[PDB]
Write a protein that binds this ligand. Structure first.
Ligand SMILES: O=C(O)c1ccc(-c2ccccc2)nc1
Length: 168
């Protein structure tokens, strides 16, 4: 149904809300939810752990089966697997982990995976355990994504700083 409500429109195609991405997935019933994936699709932490727990581990079971046959993703890459109970599809997208020395330039590649989907529910890529500056990640999103992206930021403080920064 893609029933997004209460988003702030930043550009013609990028929207943002102070919300929990799992609660958004349940309310919105999106065609695609984006996962903040790692190359091995091990969803023990971060946004990935929240999405996987909300699927009662079905996302991890499917991901383990996928990797054993198909091999790992690349940093800046993506795969499309089931959305389970959250969405029709899950776009697993690997942003660079700058906490572990990966090149922040790969964030552009990472957001280019969104352009194969008309409308997405997504977290801010490379945030949290991935260690990137969130203000920078929002700029790369706005500059790179051409399809409609609905960004869920749960931390109110961070949401307020992102919005303030974007409106400067
Ligand atoms: O046709 C669509 O875009 C579409 C279809 C199903 C869903 C869907 C939503 C929640 C759980 C499973 C699937 N979302 C979007």
């Amino acid at each position: 149904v893609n029933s997004f409500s209460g988003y702030l429109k930043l550009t013609d195609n990028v929207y943002i809300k102070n919300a929990d991405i799992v609660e958004e997935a349940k309310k919105v019933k999106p065609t695609v939810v984006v996962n903040a994936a790692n190359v091995y699709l091990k969803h023990g932490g971060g946004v990935a752990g929240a999405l996987n727990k909300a699927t009662n581990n079905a996302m991890q079971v499917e991901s383990d089966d996928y990797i054993a046959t198909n091999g790992p993703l690349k940093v800046g890459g993506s795969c499309v697997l089931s959305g389970h109970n959250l969405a029709k599809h899950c776009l697993h997208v690997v942003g660079p982990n700058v906490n572990k020395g990966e090149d922040i330039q790969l964030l552009k590649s990472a957001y280019e995976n969104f352009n194969q989907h008309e409308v997405l529910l997504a977290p801010l890529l490379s945030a949290g355990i991935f260690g990137a500056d969130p203000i920078h990640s929002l700029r790369v999103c706005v500059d790179t994504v051409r399809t409609n992206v609905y960004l869920a930021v749960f931390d109110k403080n961070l949401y307020d700083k992102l919005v303030s920064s974007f409106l400067e």
